[PDB]
Design a protein around this ligand. Structure first.
Ligand SMILES: [Cl-]
Ligand code: NA
Ligand code: NA
Ligand code: NA
Ligand code: NA
Length: 129
């Protein structure tokens, strides 16, 4: 599914991401825009052989099992294919674990380089939340 901006913001709020670990909702919408263009089915293969999955581009080296990333972990205890669902529950639950790991949202390269330090509230402007 390709979400709309305000549609995704509402879904992320219903799933508890607004102000999770201190990160306002606009941060999460901004990260999803630049990681996946709001597309739950996005995949991208990395240099090390791992793959990033879903709306928040969660990586198979640490967070999910895709059966083809040798010596990797599965810290979210899910198949990576669960992160491609039109339902964002699995991506949200795993993202909550990632953002609690110590480096906050700096784990997402697109967030650090394109959202951090900007007016992220603009990403939820106009939305009925
Ligand atoms: Cl933090
Ligand atoms: Na990316
Ligand atoms: Na990535
Ligand atoms: Na893995
Ligand atoms: Na870690």
């Amino acid at each position: 599914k390709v979400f709309g901006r305000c549609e995704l913001a509402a879904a992320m709020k219903r799933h508890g991401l607004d102000n999770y670990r201190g990160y306002s909702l606009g941060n999460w919408v901004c990260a999803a825009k630049f990681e996946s263009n709001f597309n739950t089915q996005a995949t991208n293969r990395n240099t090390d052989g791992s793959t990033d999955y879903g709306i928040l581009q969660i990586n198979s080296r640490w967070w999910c099992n895709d059966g083809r990333t040798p010596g990797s972990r599965n810290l979210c205890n899910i198949p990576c294919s669960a992160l491609l669902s039109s339902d964002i529950t699995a991506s949200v639950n795993c993202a909550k674990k990632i953002v609690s790991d110590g480096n906050g949202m700096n784990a997402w390269v697109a967030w650090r380089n394109r959202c951090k330090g900007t007016d992220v509230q603009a990403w939820i402007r106009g939305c009925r939340l």
